Design a protein around this ligand. Structure first.
Ligand SMILES: CC1=C(/C=C/C(C)=C/C=C/C(C)=C/C(=O)O)C(C)(C)CCC1
Length: 113
């Protein structure tokens, strides 16, 4: 296991997120169910080739990392929320997760280093 991984993500918040507000939307109103449907739709379009992960993240991620095309940079264990960390360190470079749930919302993660 490396000391640190670098990842990009796409976050979809919902109305029960810890902070239901984002750079792109003043109040998050979507339900948890709707957030997961959006995440699963993005996964399916990335798999078919219809959409590019980094483009989708720039446009639609509720994390301010959207401006960096979803890049979070490098991190070790003990920093991020545990489910995010566990998913990230389980990926190979170039691999993308399924849905990952944290107190922030629902994530897709792409490990880049
Ligand atoms: C995603 C994420 C985390 C926190 C996410 C949240 C809460 C992001 C906030 C974005 C906005 C946009 C907040 C706001 O506007 O209040 C940490 C690093 C702890 C664990 C995994 C990565």
């Amino acid at each position: 296991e490396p000391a640190r991984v670098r990842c990009s993500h796409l976050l979809v918040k919902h109305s029960q997120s810890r902070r239901p507000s984002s750079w792109r939307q003043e109040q998050i109103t979507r339900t948890q169910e709707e957030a997961l449907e959006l995440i699963n739709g993005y996964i399916q379009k990335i798999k078919s080739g219809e959409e590019d992960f980094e483009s989708l993240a720039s446009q639609f991620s509720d994390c301010s990392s959207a401006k960096a095309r979803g890049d979070l940079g490098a991190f070790s264990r003990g920093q991020m929320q545990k489910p995010f960390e566990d998913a990230s360190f389980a990926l190979r470079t170039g691999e993308m997760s399924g849905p990952v749930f944290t107190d922030s919302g629902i994530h897709i993660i792409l490990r880049t280093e």
